[PDB]
Ligand binder design. Structure first.
Ligand SMILES: CCCCCCCCCCCCCCCCCC(=O)OC[C@H](COP(=O)([O-])OCC(O)COP(=O)([O-])OC[C@@H](COC(=O)CCCCCCCCCCCCCCCCC)OC(=O)CCCCCCCCCCCCCCCCC)OC(=O)CCCCCCCCCCCCCCCCC
Ligand code: HEA
Ligand code: HEA
Ligand SMILES: CCCCCCCCCCCCCCCC(=O)OC[C@H](COP(=O)([O-])OCC[N+](C)(C)C)OC(=O)CCCCCCCCCCCCCCC
Ligand SMILES: CCCCCCCCCCCCCCCC(=O)OC[C@H](COP(=O)(O)OCCN)OC(=O)CCCCCCCCCCCCCCC
Ligand SMILES: CCCCCCCCCCCCCCCC(=O)OC[C@H](COP(=O)(O)OCCN)OC(=O)CCCCCCCCCCCCCCC
Ligand SMILES: CCCCCCCCCCCCCCCC(=O)OC[C@H](COP(=O)(O)OCCN)OC(=O)CCCCCCCCCCCCCCC
Ligand SMILES: CCCCCCCCCCCCCCCC(=O)OC[C@H](COP(=O)(O)OCCN)OC(=O)CCCCCCCCCCCCCCC
Ligand SMILES: [Cu+2]
Ligand SMILES: [Mg+2]
Ligand SMILES: [Zn+2]
Lengths: 104, 45, 51, 121, 534, 134
C-alpha cells in the first residue's frame, strides 16, 4: 500500500506481525522492518518485540532492540523517558543494556 | 519534539560544525589555483 | 561440448601452471600497448627531421 | 534400427524420433511433415494442447514459511527466484537462490522456497 | 582452446576479449595523452622538435582511439555482452555470431587506425575529421582513408552489437520480466542500442561521402565545384552529440546500480528515472547543432537550439537529484566502487554546469574551439564514463573474474586518479576564458602556468593507471589469498543492524538483480532452466 | 537444569579471543551458548552475556569494517607517496626535454614586452604585466 500509514494502523499492523513469528529469522526480520521505517515505535510495539524475542529463546536480539532504539531517538532525554517506561519488563525479563554491560 | 531538548538546538548542534568543514573542503577543492598562484613569480615572489 | 569451468578457465591467460612468470606476459601486454605511440612518434620523427 | 516418428508428444524418445516423413513431388511441405528437432517438439506440443518451455510468473498468492514452503520445480539443483511480496508487487524484487539442500528465505517478504528437484541427470 | 576463444559464440567469453582490447587501447590512448600533455608543458618546441603534423596525428589518435576503442567497448560491448543476458535470464544473447563479429571487427579497425598514423606523414584533423582540411588538395596520402576505414569498422561493430542487444532484451527475457520491471542497466543498454542504430548510419553515410569525394572525384564538400563543407558539419554532429549520449547513458545505469547496492536502498523512483533517461535518448537528436553556433546559422535557428539544449539539461538534473535522494538516508558502506560513484556525481555535475554555460548560443561565441570546451568534455566524458567504468569494474569483477582485489590499493588508486585528474582539467577553464585556442602545438607564452600545472597533474593521472595495472596483476595472482588472508572486502552488502552473523550466513547476498547470485566465475550454461520472477 | 553452564576458562576474554580460536572450538561454544539461552534469562551469568553479544553481533567476520586498524593511515601514506613519486618522475622526465628556451622567456625580454603594452595602454583596468620568470 503506497498510501500513507497512520500511527495506530502502524502499531496494530506490527503488533499482529510480532505475534505471529516463530523462528529467529522471522523475529529479526520483522524487527528490522519495524526499525527501518521513519518513525520510532511506541513502547507498545517494543515490549511485544521483547516478548516475541523471549518466545524464540535468544538473548542478544533483546539487547539490540535497546541499542537500535538509542540510535533511533533524537537525544537522550527521550531515551531516558523511554527507558523508564520499559523498566519492569526489562526487570522480570532480565535483559541488560549496552553501556552498563560494556563499560567504555 | 514534545519533551527533550528542542529540535532546533539538537540539529543546530549537529549541523553548525558541518558548515565550516564543508567550507574548508570546498575552499580546497576549488581554491588550490590560488595556492599555486601564491608561490609563483607572477605575484613578485 | 560445454567447456569446463573454474576460477582460471574464464580468461585467455594461463596463470598457475606455466614455465615463465605471469608478470612477463601481463606487463609485456601493456608494454607494447604503451609503446605503440612511441614507435609511431619514432617512425614519424625519422621521416621528417632527426631522431 | 526401427524408428517411427512420434505422431504426438507422447511417443518422443530423444532426438531421433522428431524427423517425420518427407513431402511428395508436387505438394508444398507443411510444417508437420518436414520440421525436425526442437521446433518439431514445440509444434507437436502446441498441436496436442500443451506448450513446452513452461513460462509463467511464480505463485505469489500465499506467503508460505517452513511448515509448508512455496514449492518450485527445476530440472537442475538450483533455480533463481525473484520474490516480489505476498501480493504481486509489494516490495522491490529480491533474488534468492533455492537449491536442492537449502531452502531460500526472503528476508524482506519472509517467504521460503523449496524445490522438488526433478533432475534425471 | 582455439574453439573457445576464436570461434566462441558465447556471450561470456566475448566480453573478456572486449575488455582485453579495451585495456590495451586505453593504455595506448593514455600514452598519447601523456605525450600531448608532456609536449604542451612549456612554450617553445619541446620533446617532439617542431613537427606540428605529428602533434595533430597524436591528438587525433588519442581522441579517436580512447573514444571508439576504450569507452565504447568497455561500456557497450564488454559490459553489455557480459551483463545484459545475465540480468534478464537469457542463457546468453540472441544472434551470437553477430556479437562475435562485432568484437572481431573491432581490433582490425584498431590495426588500420594504428597503421594510418605511419604512412605519408599522417592524418591530422582531430577526431572531428573535417573538409576541406581532409580533402586531397590540402591533405594528400592514404593516411586519413585508413583513419576513417577504422571508423567504418568500429561503426559496423557498434551497430551489430546494438541490433544484438535490442533483440536479446526485447525477446529473450525470463519468465516474469514485464516491459517495465528490468534493472536500470538493462534499460540503459536498451536505449543506447536504440540510439546507435538511429544515429551512426548518418555518420557512416557522411564519412563515406568524405571518402568518395577524397578518392572518387565527387564533390560533396569540395566547394569549387558546387558543394559546401557546412553539410559535413551537419552530417557529422547529427551523430556527434548522440555518440556521447551513447557513451554516457550506460554510465548512468552503472552508477544507479552501485549507489543502489552500497547504500542499502532502492533508487528513488526508478520509473521516473527511466522515463528521464528515455526522454534524454529521444531528445538527444534534436540538439545536434550546438557544436555549430559559429559557422553562420541564423539567429532564429540558434535561438531554437539554445532553447532546446536546456530542456536537454533538465532530465539529467532530475536524475542527479534522484541519485542524491537514493543515497540520502542510507547506510553508506564506503568501499572502492562507492567512492567512484560518489565522485562521479560531483565531477559530472561540475562539467554539466559548465556545459550549460556553453549551451547558450549567445555565450558560445566567446568559448568555441577553446580550452573551456576541453575542460567541459574532459569532465563529462573522462570523469563521467571512466569513473562509471571503474565503479563497474571494482563492483562487478569479484563476481565475473572470481578473484577479489586488494582494497587499500584500490582506494589509493581512486584518490590518486581523483586528485591527479582534478588538477589537470580544472586549469583548462582558466586557459579557456583567458583565450587559448584548441589543437595548437603550443602557444603564445602568456598563459605559461596553467599548462605546467596540468602537465604536472597528468603524470599523477598516469601513475594511478600504472597502479591500476598492478591492481589487475595482484587480483590475477592473489585472488584466493585476498579471499582468505583479510586484505580485501568480501561482502559488498553488509549485514543489517539487528541481524546476527549466524543469520547473515543464511542469506548471504541481498541482491536485486540476478548477477550476484551466480557463483564466482559463473557456469558456461548458467540458466539451464529459466529464472522465475513474480 | 539439564544443560551445564560454560566454565570461566572456556569463555574468558572472548572478544580478544574469537579470531585465533580454532573452528572446532567455535562451534562448540556457539552450541553451548545457544542452549544456555533457553533458560530463564536472569540466571545467565554476566560473563557469558558479553560472550553471546560478541558471538552474534561482534565486529568479526561478516561485520568486519572496511577501514580496519589504521588503514586510513596507510592509504593517506600511499596517496602522498604517489604524489611524491609522480613529482620526482615528472622532474627527471622534464630534465631531458630541450636545452634551449625560446629567447623571449627571461625577465629581461618581459620588461620590454610590457613596456610596449603600457605604451599602447592594453588591458587598462585588469592585469597587463607579464613577467612570470626568475
Ligand atoms: C632513500 C630512502 C628510501 C626509504 C624512504 C624513507 C623511509 O624509510 O620511509 C619509510 C617509512 C616507514 O618505514 P618503517 O616503518 O621503518 O618500515 C616499515 C617496516 O620496517 C617494515 O618494512 P620492511 O622491513 O618489510 O621493508 C623492507 C624494505 C626493503 O628495502 C631494501 O631492501 C633496501 C632498499 C630500499 C630502497 C630501494 O622495503 C622498504 O622499506 C621500502 C622503503 C621505501 O614510511 C613513511 O615514512 C611514510 C610513507 C611515505 C609518506 C609520504 C612521503 C612523501
Ligand atoms: C574518451 C574520451 C577522452 C578521455 C578520457 C581523455 C583524457 C585525456 N586527454 Fe583528451 N581529448 C579527447 C578525448 C578524451 N581525452 C577528445 C575527443 C579531444 C578533442 C580532440 C580534437 O578536437 O582535436 C581531446 C583533446 C585533448 C587535449 C586538448 C588538446 C587540444 O585539442 O588542444 C589534451 C591536453 O591535455 C588531451 C590529453 C588527455 C590526457 C592527458 C587525458 C588523461 O585524462 C588520460 C588519463 C585517463 C585515464 C587514466 C583513464 C583510465 C584508463 C584506463 C585504460 C582504465 C581502464 C579501465 C577499464 C577498462 C574499466 N586530450
Ligand atoms: C559525453 C558526451 C557529452 C555530454 C553528456 C555532454 C554534456 C553537455 N554538453 Fe558538451 N561536449 C561534448 C560532449 C558531451 N557534452 C564534446 C565531445 C564536445 C567538444 C566537441 C568539439 O570537438 O567541438 C563538447 C562541447 C560542448 C559544446 C560545443 C561548444 C563548442 O564546441 O563550441 C556544447 C554546446 O552546447 C556543450 C554543452 C553541453 C550541455 C548543455 C550538456 C548537458 O547534457 C549536461 C547536463 C548536466 C547538467 C545540466 C548538470 C546536472 C544538472 C543539475 C545539477 C540540475 C541544475 C542544472 C540546471 C538548471 C542547468 N558541450
Ligand atoms: C629523486 C628525483 C628528485 C628530483 C630530481 C631533479 C628534478 C629536476 O631537476 O626538475 C627540473 C624541473 C624544472 O622545470 P623547468 O623550470 O620547466 O625546466 C625544464 C628543464 N629544461 C627543459 C629547461 C632543461 O623542476 C620541476 O619541474 C619540479 C616540479 C615542479 C615543483 C614540484 C611541485 C610538487 C610539490 C612539491
Ligand atoms: C569557481 C572557481 C573559483 C576559484 C578559482 C580560483 C582561481 C585562483 C587564481 O588563480 O587567481 C589568480 C588571478 C590572478 O590574475 P591577475 O588578473 O591578477 O593576473 C595578473 C598577473 N600579473 O586572480 C584573479 O584574476 C581574480 C581572483 C580569483 C577569481 C576567481 C575566478 C573567477 C572566474 C571563475 C573562473 C572559473 C570558471 C569555472 C566554470 C565552471
Ligand atoms: C591538489 C594537490 C596537487 C596539486 C599540485 C600542484 C602543483 C603545481 C605546480 O607544479 O606548481 C608550479 C608553481 C609555479 O612555479 P613557476 O611557474 O614559478 O616555476 C617555473 C618552472 N619551475 O611552483 C610552485 O608554486 C611551488 C609550490 C607548490 C605549491 C602547491 C600547493 C598546492 C595546494
Ligand atoms: C553490414 C551489416 C549486416 C547486418 C545484417 C543484419 C541481419 C539480421 C539477421 O537476421 O541476422 C541473421 C544472420 C546472423 O545470425 P546468427 O547466425 O547469429 O543467428 C543464429 C540463429 N538465431 O545473418 C547476418 O547478420 C550476417 C550478416 C553479415 C554478413 C556479412 C556482411 C559483411 C559486411
Ligand atoms: C579533497 C582531499 C584531497 C586530499 C586527499 C588526500 C588523501 C586523503 C585520504 C582520505 C581517506 O583516507 O579517507 C578514508 C576515510 C574513511 O573513514 P570512515 O568514515 O570509513 O571511518 C570509519 C572507521 N571505522 O574517509 C572516507 O572515505 C569518507 C570520505 C569520502 C570521500 C569521498 C570523496 C569523493 C570525491 C569528492 C566528492 C565531493 C566531496 C567534496 C565536496 C564536498
Ligand atoms: Cu553535443
Ligand atoms: Mg570548431
Ligand atoms: Zn519477497
Amino acid at each position: 500500500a503506497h498510501d500513507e500509514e497512520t500511527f495506530e494502523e502502524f502499531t496494530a499492523r506490527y503488533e499482529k506481525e510480532f505475534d505471529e513469528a516463530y523462528d529467529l529469522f522471522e523475529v529479526q526480520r520483522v524487527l528490522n522492518n519495524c526499525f527501518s521505517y521513519d518513525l520510532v515505535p511506541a513502547p507498545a510495539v517494543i515490549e511485544k518485540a521483547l516478548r516475541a524475542a523471549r518466545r524464540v529463546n535468544d538473548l542478544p536480539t533483546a539487547i539490540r532492540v535497546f541499542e537500535a532504539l538509542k540510535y533511533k531517538v533524537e537525544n537522550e532525554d527521550q531515551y531516558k523517558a523511554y527507558l523508564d517506561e520499559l523498566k519492569d519488563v526489562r526487570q522480570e525479563l532480565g535483559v541488560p543494556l549496552k553501556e552498563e554491560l560494556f563499560p567504555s | 519534539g514534545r519533551i527533550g531538548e528542542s529540535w532546533v538546538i539538537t540539529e543546530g548542534r549537529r549541523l553548525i560544525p558541518e558548515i565550516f568543514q564543508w567550507s574548508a573542503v570546498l575552499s580546497v577543492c576549488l581554491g588550490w589555483p590560488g595556492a599555486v598562484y601564491f608561490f609563483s613569480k607572477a605575484r613578485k615572489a | 561440448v560445454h567447456f569446463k569451468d573454474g576460477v582460471y578457465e574464464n580468461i585467455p591467460f594461463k596463470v598457475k601452471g606455466r614455465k615463465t612468470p605471469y608478470a612477463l606476459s601481463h606487463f609485456g601486454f601493456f608494454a607494447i600497448g604503451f609503446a605503440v605511440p612511441f614507435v609511431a612518434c619514432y617512425v614519424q620523427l625519422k621521416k621528417s627531421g632527426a631522431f | 534400427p526401427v524408428v517411427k516418428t512420434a505422431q504426438n508428444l507422447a511417443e518422443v524418445n530423444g532426438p531421433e524420433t522428431l524427423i517425420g516423413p518427407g513431402a511428395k513431388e508436387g505438394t508444398v511441405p507443411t510444417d508437420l511433415d518436414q520440421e525436425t528437432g526442437l521446433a518439431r517438439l514445440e509444434l507437436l506440443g502446441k498441436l496436442e494442447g500443451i506448450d513446452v518451455f513452461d513460462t509463467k510468473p511464480l505463485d505469489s498468492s500465499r506467503k508460505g514459511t517452513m511448515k509448508d514452503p512455496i514449492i518450485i520445480e527445476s530440472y537442475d539443483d538450483y533455480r533463481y527466484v525473484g520474490c516480489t511480496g505476498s501480493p504481486a508487487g509489494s516490495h522491490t524484487i529480491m533474488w534468492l537462490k533455492p537449491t536442492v539442500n537449502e531452502v531460500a528465505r526472503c528476508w524482506e517478504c519472509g517467504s521460503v522456497y523449496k524445490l522438488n528437484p526433478v533432475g534425471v541427470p | 582452446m582455439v574453439q573457445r576463444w576464436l570461434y566462441s559464440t558465447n556471450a561470456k567469453d566475448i566480453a573478456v576479449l572486449y575488455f582485453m582490447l579495451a585495456i590495451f587501447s586505453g593504455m595506448a590512448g593514455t600514452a598519447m595523452s601523456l605525450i600531448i600533455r608532456l609536449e604542451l608543458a612549456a612554450p617553445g618546441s619541446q620533446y617532439l622538435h617542431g613537427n606540428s603534423q605529428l602533434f595533430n596525428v597524436l591528438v587525433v589518435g588519442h581522441a579517436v582511439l580512447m573514444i571508439f576503442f576504450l569507452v565504447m567497448p568497455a561500456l557497450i560491448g564488454g559490459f553489455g555482452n557480459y551483463l545484459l543476458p545475465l540480468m534478464i535470464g537469457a542463457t546468453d544473447t540472441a544472434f551470437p555470431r553477430i556479437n562475435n563479429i562485432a568484437f572481431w571487427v573491432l581490433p582490425m579497425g584498431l590495426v588500420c587506425l594504428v597503421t594510418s598514423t605511419l604512412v605519408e606523414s599522417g592524418a591530422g584533423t582531430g577526431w572531428t575529421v573535417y573538409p576541406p582540411l581532409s580533402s586531397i588538395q590540402a591533405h594528400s596520402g592514404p593516411s586519413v582513408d585508413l583513419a576513417i576505414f577504422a571508423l567504418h569498422l568500429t561503426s559496423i561493430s557498434s551497430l551489430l552489437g546494438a541490433i544484438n542487444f535490442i533483440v536479446t532484451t526485447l525477446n529473450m527475457r525470463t519468465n516474469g520480466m514485464t516491459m517495465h520491471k528490468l534493472p536500470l542497466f538493462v534499460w540503459s543498454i536498451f536505449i543506447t542500442a536504440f540510439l546507435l542504430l538511429l544515429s551512426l548510419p548518418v555518420l557512416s553515410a557522411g564519412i563515406t561521402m568524405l571518402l568518395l569525394d577524397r578518392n572518387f572525384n565527387t564533390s560533396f564538400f569540395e566547394v569549387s565545384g558546387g558543394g559546401d563543407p557546412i553539410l559535413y558539419e551537419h552530417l557529422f554532429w547529427f551523430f556527434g552529440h548522440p555518440e556521447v549520449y551513447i557513451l554516457i547513458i550506460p554510465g548512468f545505469g552503472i552508477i544507479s546500480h552501485v549507489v543502489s547496492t552500497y547504500s542499502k536502498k532502492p533508487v528513488f523512483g526508478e520509473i521516473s528515472m527511466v522515463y528521464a533517461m528515455a526522454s534524454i535518448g529521444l531528445l538527444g537528436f534534436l540538439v545536434w547543432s550546438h557544436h555549430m553556433y559559429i559557422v553562420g546559422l541564423d539567429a532564429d535557428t540558434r535561438a531554437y537550439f539554445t532553447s532546446a539544449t536546456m530542456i536537454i539539461a533538465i532530465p539529467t538534473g532530475i536524475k542527479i537529484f534522484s541519485w542524491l535522494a537514493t543515497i540520502h538516508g542510507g547506510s553508506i558502506r564506503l568501499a572502492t566502487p562507492m567512492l567512484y560513484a560518489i565522485a562521479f556525481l560531483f565531477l559530472f555535475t561540475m562539467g554539466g554546469l559548465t556545459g550549460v554555460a556553453l549551451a547558450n548560443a549567445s555565450l558560445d561565441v566567446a568559448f568555441h574551439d577553446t580550452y573551456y570546451v576541453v575542460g567541459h568534455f574532459h569532465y563529462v566524458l573522462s570523469m563521467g564514463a571512466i569513473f562509471s567504468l571503474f565503479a563497474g569494474y571494482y563492483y562487478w569483477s569479484p563476481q565475473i573474474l572470481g578473484l577479489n582485489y586488494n582494497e587499500k590499493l584500490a582506494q589509493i588508486q581512486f584518490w590518486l586518479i581523483f586528485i591527479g585528474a582534478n588538477v589537470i582539467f580544472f586549469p583548462m577553464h582558466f586557459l579557456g576564458i583567458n583565450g587559448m585556442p584548441r589543437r595548437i602545438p603550443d602557444y603564445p607564452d602568456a598563459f605559461a602556468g596553467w599548462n605546467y600545472v596540468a602537465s604536472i597533474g597528468s603524470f599523477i593521472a598516469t601513475l594511478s593507471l600504472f597502479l591500476f595495472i598492478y591492481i589487475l596483476y595482484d587480483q590475477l595472482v592473489n585472488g584466493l589469498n585476498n579471499k582468505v588472508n583479510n586484505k580485501s572486502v568480501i561482502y559488498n552488502k553488509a549485514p543489517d543492524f539487528v541481524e546476527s552473523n549466524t543469520i547473515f550466513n543464511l542469506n548471504t547476498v541481498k541482491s536485486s538483480s540476478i548477477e550476484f547470485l551466480l557463483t564466482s566465475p559463473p557456469a558456461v550454461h548458467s540458466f539451464n532452466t529459466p529464472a522465475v520472477q513474480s | 537444569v539439564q544443560t551445564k553452564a560454560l566454565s570461566k576458562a572456556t569463555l574468558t576474554d572472548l572478544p580478544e579471543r574469537w579470531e585465533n580460536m580454532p573452528n572446532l572450538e567455535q562451534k562448540e561454544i556457539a552450541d553451548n551458548l545457544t542452549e544456555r539461552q533457553k533458560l530463564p534469562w536472569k540466571t545467565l551469568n554476566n560473563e557469558e552475556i558479553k560472550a553471546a553479544w560478541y558471538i552474534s553481533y561482534g565486529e568479526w567476520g561478516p561485520r568486519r569494517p572496511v577501514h580496519g586498524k589504521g588503514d586510513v593511515a596507510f592509504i593517506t601514506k600511499g596517496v602522498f607517496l604517489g604524489l611524491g613519486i609522480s613529482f620526482g618522475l615528472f622532474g627527471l622526465v622534464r630534465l631531458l626535454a630541450n636545452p634551449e628556451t625560446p629567447k623571449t622567456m627571461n625577465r629581461e625580454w618581459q620588461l620590454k614586452s610590457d613596456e610596449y603594452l603600457k605604451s599602447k595602454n592594453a588591458n587598462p583596468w585588469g592585469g597587463y604585466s607579464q613577467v612570470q620568470s626568475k
